[PDB]
Ligand binder design. Sequence first.
Ligand SMILES: [Zn+2]
Ligand SMILES: [Zn+2]
Ligand SMILES: [Zn+2]
Ligand SMILES: [Zn+2]
Ligand SMILES: [Zn+2]
Ligand SMILES: [Zn+2]
Lengths: 316, 316, 316, 316, 316, 316
Amino acid sequence: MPLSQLQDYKPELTNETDFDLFWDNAKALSNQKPLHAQVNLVQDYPLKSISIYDVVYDGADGTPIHGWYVTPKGEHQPGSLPVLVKYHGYSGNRGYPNELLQWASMGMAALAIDVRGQGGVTPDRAEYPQGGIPGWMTLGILDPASYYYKQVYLDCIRALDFVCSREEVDASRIAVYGGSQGGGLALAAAGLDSRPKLALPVFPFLCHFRRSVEIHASGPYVEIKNWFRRYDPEHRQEEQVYRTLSYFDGMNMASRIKARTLMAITLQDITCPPSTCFAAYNHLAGPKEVRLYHDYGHEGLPFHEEAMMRFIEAYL
Amino acid sequence: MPLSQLQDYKPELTNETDFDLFWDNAKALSNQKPLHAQVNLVQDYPLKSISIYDVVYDGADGTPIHGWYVTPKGEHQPGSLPVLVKYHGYSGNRGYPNELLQWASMGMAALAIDVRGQGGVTPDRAEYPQGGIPGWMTLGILDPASYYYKQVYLDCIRALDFVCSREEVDASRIAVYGGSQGGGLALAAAGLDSRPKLALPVFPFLCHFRRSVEIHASGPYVEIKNWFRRYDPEHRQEEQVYRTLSYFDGMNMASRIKARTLMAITLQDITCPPSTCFAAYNHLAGPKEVRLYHDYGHEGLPFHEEAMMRFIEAYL
Amino acid sequence: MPLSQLQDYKPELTNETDFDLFWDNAKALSNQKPLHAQVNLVQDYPLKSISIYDVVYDGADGTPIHGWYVTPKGEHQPGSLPVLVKYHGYSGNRGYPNELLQWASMGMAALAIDVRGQGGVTPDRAEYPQGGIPGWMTLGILDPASYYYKQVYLDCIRALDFVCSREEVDASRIAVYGGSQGGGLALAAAGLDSRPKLALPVFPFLCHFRRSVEIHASGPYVEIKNWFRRYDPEHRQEEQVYRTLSYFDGMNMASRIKARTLMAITLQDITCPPSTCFAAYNHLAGPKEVRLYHDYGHEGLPFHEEAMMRFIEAYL
Amino acid sequence: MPLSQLQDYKPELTNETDFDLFWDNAKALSNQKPLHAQVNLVQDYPLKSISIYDVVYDGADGTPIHGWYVTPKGEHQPGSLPVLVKYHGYSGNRGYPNELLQWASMGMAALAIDVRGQGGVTPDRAEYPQGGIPGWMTLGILDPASYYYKQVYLDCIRALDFVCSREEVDASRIAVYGGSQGGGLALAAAGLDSRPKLALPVFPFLCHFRRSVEIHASGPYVEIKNWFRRYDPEHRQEEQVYRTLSYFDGMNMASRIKARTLMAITLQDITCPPSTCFAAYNHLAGPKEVRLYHDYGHEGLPFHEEAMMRFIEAYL
Amino acid sequence: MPLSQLQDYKPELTNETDFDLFWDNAKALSNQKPLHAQVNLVQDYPLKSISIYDVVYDGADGTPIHGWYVTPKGEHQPGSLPVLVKYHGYSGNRGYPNELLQWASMGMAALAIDVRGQGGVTPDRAEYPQGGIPGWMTLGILDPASYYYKQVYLDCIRALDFVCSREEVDASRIAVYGGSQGGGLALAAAGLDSRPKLALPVFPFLCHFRRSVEIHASGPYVEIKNWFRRYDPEHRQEEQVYRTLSYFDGMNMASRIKARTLMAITLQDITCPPSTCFAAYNHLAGPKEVRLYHDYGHEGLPFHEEAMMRFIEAYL
Amino acid sequence: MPLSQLQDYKPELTNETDFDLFWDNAKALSNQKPLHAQVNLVQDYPLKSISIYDVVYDGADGTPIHGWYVTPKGEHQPGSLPVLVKYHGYSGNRGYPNELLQWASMGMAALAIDVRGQGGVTPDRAEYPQGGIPGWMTLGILDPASYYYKQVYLDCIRALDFVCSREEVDASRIAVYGGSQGGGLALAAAGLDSRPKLALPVFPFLCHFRRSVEIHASGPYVEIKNWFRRYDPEHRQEEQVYRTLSYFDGMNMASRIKARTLMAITLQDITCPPSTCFAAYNHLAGPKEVRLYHDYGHEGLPFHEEAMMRFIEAYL
Ligand SMILES: [Zn+2]
Ligand SMILES: [Zn+2]
Ligand SMILES: [Zn+2]
Ligand SMILES: [Zn+2]
Ligand SMILES: [Zn+2]
Ligand SMILES: [Zn+2]
């Protein structure tokens, strides 16, 4: 897709008429299950200008979700610290505490959590009706009530609960952030919950699934293709598959975001094609900015750090 | 490693002292769990020379294992039919019933089963303490009691319980067969159970783990290397990782096989490298024969089918 | 080409006005040359349900063409058995007798032949006026009377004469099938001869030659571009190259097919692109069905075996 | 090379008798050229807990070398701040000020400089006798006095003079750090200068040149091979090429390092192969530690940040 | 862009209003530096049929440009000999004198020169305000006056002055030739100077710069993309970049060429895309002819030698 | 293999006892069959310093062999011109008359011929008993009397009868030259016939077949490996295959060469590996010289032309 085409690219929403009903039912599941947040301070870490906490809280179905919570060292009044909540890339994990340093040295608290079952210490306790393709995208794909990303989305909202359980945190100054899957999950946390003030998705995955699969996006979108290869080579269940996926689709989530958003889009990206990123961005309901990186694909953006900082200082 | 060294290659066993104890505990756990076999005749399949059953039995933890059970059509006396159990490759499934025809046309019954959680309708109900690398090789890798392949090997022994429960089947004429993961599973079945008379591993996976990994074998062995990359970059838990895997290592299973064995090894194979295949082959306790395909890798072997037919006709 | 355009794609036929006269003359060559069939029962083969014959008969120019002819065991009444003729892929051969087991267990005969000069025991005794590119697609390319595929199309017709010469065979129940080049040869056999009742081409090669070269199909179509590279850099003989190949083109054959046809088309195929396959399917002159496999390329299709067996049970 | 041998690989020093005399003459010539340091406070950076200066100093031939110099915010006591000098990888640059954040938040000053002529605003004003291969590895390669890395190794040392000219900086607590080319530059700086107290090379480039080229390392070592291709196909000038490179070789620089060294070595690295890194490590004249990452090549080492930081805290 | 559109493709010229004034200011400053042309006869080169000279003249900034100059043997009259000047590919050099033998066996003189800085003995003495990407495409890119190909273009013209100052040579029968980079230089040579009678560009590089970058052409055009990556990720300096490059574009030069031009264009070339070559061709102002090699990419064209010889004989 | 042991690598000759008898017999038949050479002068070729002839002679089995025969223009005394015979690379052809110009300008006659069946107008009249792999390496491989290179070798010896039958040629000053397959044919022409004075093989193909195959050389040796994949997966026919190829092997030919030889060997060559070329070099019987190009693979060698020209001046 050429560029002035991408910038007006606004395909029709795929949300089923029961989208909000499905979600507030899923949120009722979460409301009945307490956080039971365990927070243990790490004192053997060499950075020293920040406080580092090892965190675990219960997901809606009892899965213990692990994170790192970091603050500036020193005394903080109740409701004084802004907070950034960071979600991570497909197969990754909470990372190391020092990657939250930038946020803490701006005066902010920050949280990085594991996505259940991925390459960390957080397991996946949900049960699925059938097997799948290596990875997570195809687990429970035939029914949205059992789909892998239902409990993931709920784990991501309960991270906002954890931050607001801390009295030093200012609940009116929450940003959600992430690259790729991380960016998908920030769109969903800002789409499903009212509390986030800013969203900063970078090349978000989990957007416009039908198109992503159709144009042979690389990376984890190929799992959905491999699903059809093994389960349904004539595409007879195609409709059930894309219907299930519509409830988690970032484009549908974007139509319900009122938070101010800064999106980063990379024009040579073949894992999260920019037409899927622009699909979501142009359905954003609140004010928004975009950074277009013409010659970058799915990879590190060291220059984007400073743009995110400016944005946060201006509006958080 | 050159061919004449391949066949003198007999590295030390890595079985811990309690290998047999770990397994007969896991087996006694399976012995308390009835199979609850359900069978259902497929009506209107194009082949009318065979009867085809859609089959489900419970694993030891209650997971419903699906399969296909195929016999020559018509009457058979109790205890008359020899039987072949087929196990499938990594990520695959029970396949299609026409792939078991060959066996039925030789007057045999045959069963193919799903491996739990892979590309089939058979899910994985076991719980793991942590997440993992996409795939199944790293689930529960820190403790053999909770490791993925524990319940897989038990499902595979329970496939022998299923075929032995068929009244038409002759329980003294059972063969176990599979390629790659399939071949590893057939060495497990024959290693952990006395009933199989023949074992037909094709390029068996799950053999000589520490060598597979260190010589940088491609395919699923790479998940173990990626475990290290994410969880343990200085290899401080390498000892626990390879002691977990030793309980499941086909080289240690081979040492308890008394069945007559026909192994295929492909000399250009970078996925199940031939030194790891030879290492298990050179520890087989019973009679054995090998087919060496010099210019083939990890790929379909059209000529091998005939070689297995002759072996089966001669000895089963 | 996008799926909705693909299905309606029906380009102009390239057949020259003397297309049927050429083939009439080429068939008169075949009429001069008797078969001299030799049939020899294969002994000690492990499948005892079937009788397997090792077969040779002469091509029109005298080339000994070898095959496997397989029947159900025991005697059969004159004219009783339906028969399947199998043609193989580019560089392949007659295969192994066990690959025709499925047809015998359905109560049918079957025949698999070598294509002349390819990777079996059947040489190519035709003489060509010039050299060529490695392979067979460019031999004699400047004159259809001397082109590689004339004597090949005639050996394919003579395979049908071989089967009708068998006492047990029913001439009114002949099917022809094959994949890739075999699919092309099946199209040729049904379009040039009236005897075949069914045709089952899978992603057929030798279709819409000028398109297949122009869009840069991989695999053997590349030999034609290489021909221009070596013999005709400026495309001065372009019109004569495409004229020669128009006489062998499956799209032209398909317009003369009255047999009922089941075609498989793989949508990601880059060796036999689907626009070229559909170009033939949409010129077929008899009843037709298509199976379209969205996420497969040029590869094995284990699900298609059952679709073919059903088609043959229904219609042969 | 297998691991235990690799850990003890200590090949013979290639330094000419000349080596210290050559560098004595090059350094004396540099000391005739004032620094002419210019420093400009960056305003309107979003962080605010650090002071950020845009920095330029003269190289020994007048080239204006650019950098970022970063301190914790506020005034500091004379001679109080430890300092980290970071040199960058092949083709890169001084990066972004936020990348020096972690050093500053430990109480340290930090300087990141451009390597002359590579991907930043610092040109290269040195003149060379011939042309060369794209890149910088082959510029002046027939004469050590005109070789690209002579003015580069002097620019790096003059970075130590710029930090020492800052009143806040403690000259007895200097650490030199870098990855790849930067690891190479760090070994040179610590080897040709007596001021660095710590060296932290990550998979250093510019070590054991003759072995690097002849085991066909990837990356910029390829430029040297291409030099032979273009200028000397039969290797008649090879002894002059390797004599030149010997004055720059990290292994020869290591035998002159008395500073305490922490080296990161990647085992699968094919750009800076592990034998070349180990050759240097085993010639280091001071106290040393190694981190050996088995499953990592030429890539980011995020776990390594924590290890450098603990090392800086115990010893800087 | 398909074949019939390619041929008519005549995009708008990008030359700025001051294009002619940029170039007569660059020539003014070239005019003031005398050629200082020196020659030197090579002794026992094995071809005795030809006179072989090792040659050196000064570029406009005193860079000494080395060449091979070849004439038919013995002494010649004043003004008798026609002459062909050959420019070389990206990163290459003057070649070997045997490569000019064919032009000399036609009773011509021939000159092949090094392009400054590339893979020969000729250095580059121009100074640039910043660094660059490895290679030469990005040196001085922000400023037309400081751009790498300014002095290159001037050295290519002064090659003309060198041949025109040899007594044997006939200034009215000058041809300029070369492949890829050489093709672009030949374009610029015949477009900036009145003297060449014939131009023979082969798949010229340095043509239609914006298009070459935007369609992801391989080879050196990718350096301009890597420039934006490293220096300007949001393309805020896109305009100055392409402006600079417009002073050097073959398209703009070709407008001013009144000489007679034979252009080889390769339809599968991904380094020098046929659209950019046809853009330059359809802007030629004098007579022209084209050879369109359909199945050739960026490579040797042994058949094109004869065509160039025919064009020369007929018109030089 | 490392260079020191390459230079002393002289493995065992694989010639059978009947190697000389085989070739005695094939040459006796060849000697009974006249050449019936036709020779027609080419007109309107732009060069003029040369006389060019289109040539055709009969092979020993009746294939018409086509070539180009080139001399200095004008008349010449009987027996006065030395001659170079050029054989081409695999899939190639006689090339263009301008590529012989170099040899003509030295005062020589030059002949380039076609290899039967390859990318020219020369067909292949031989009959083979079986099929093969695409290309010509496998044709007739189970029997030396029918092997493809038997009649090629004889046609190469008949190129010498053709040049000796020309009045102007000096039969005592024949040189045979070629690269890759051409180098193999040069070695066979010098090993089978007594007339050539010089041999100039460049990276000879057709050497030490068993090694080349078993170390996985790319290019046409891969045909022999593909022969085992298709015909003989378990290598039951490996000694018949290598016995056939031993009759054609350049290493065995080299044992019988009396002529003076200049060999170019490329050290990074993966198509014609250097140990296979050294195996031949080290069995040469007469005097010899080598040029080792250390960083070159299977590609053009523009510096080698001059060294060959020096060799020919010195010794022809
Ligand atoms: Zn959707
Ligand atoms: Zn182990
Ligand atoms: Zn056509
Ligand atoms: Zn050295
Ligand atoms: Zn432009
Ligand atoms: Zn041999």
